[PDB]
Amino acid sequence: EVETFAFQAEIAQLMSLIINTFYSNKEIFLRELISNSSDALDKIRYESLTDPSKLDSGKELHINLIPNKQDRTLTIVDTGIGMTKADLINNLGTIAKSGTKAFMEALQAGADISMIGQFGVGFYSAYLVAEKVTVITKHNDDEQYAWESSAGGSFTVRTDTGEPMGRGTKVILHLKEDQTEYLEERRIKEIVKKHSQFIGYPITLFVEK
């Protein structure tokens, strides 16, 4: 059963701005997604400090980057706290609305698209490089869900019956035809070294077969 939802007007506007604005410094999407992973990992780590059983769904706290040339996807996987259905339907939309308003105001005051992450909407930088984004997520005491959107004003959510992930978030970027540079080992290594050198969790860049 697949449910389709409308983005709030302000979030659709943000996505169209990201998709339509001429802006060459697209590589920052990776910094933003890795930063999101670090935050999700910090959250589960903090919870585990007072309740060790929070890690029953997996003790390892890390990030995997997985390029796949055949599927034309770059996947960012973390074992962080994950997301509830309420996150995907209501919570992150409430945060995105106020964050978008502030991001828009900053852009008018001379800020640039790379500063998106400072407004709690860095996730949407994925649309700088991806035609479709699929997110698989699992939070303790909630079911595994797949969220998906190719923008255009709507997203879907379904309960995911594919491979179980234990706990965390997996962002699958279906890359635009002209953005396949972010599948090259040398390029990903460069971007990670440049923007994500002090992340407090292992980042493993998988090699392609």
Ligand SMILES: N=c1nc2c3c(NCCO)cc(F)cc3nc(Cc3ccc4c(c3)OCO4)n2[nH]1
């Ligand atoms: N403003 C954001 N929106 C998302 C976000 C998202 N938004 C569309 C929901 O209908 C879908 C998704 F699959 C992952 C996301 N992942 C993130 C990153 C994030 C940030 C804070 C969080 C979070 C995830 O989960 C709990 O608190 N965001 N941030």
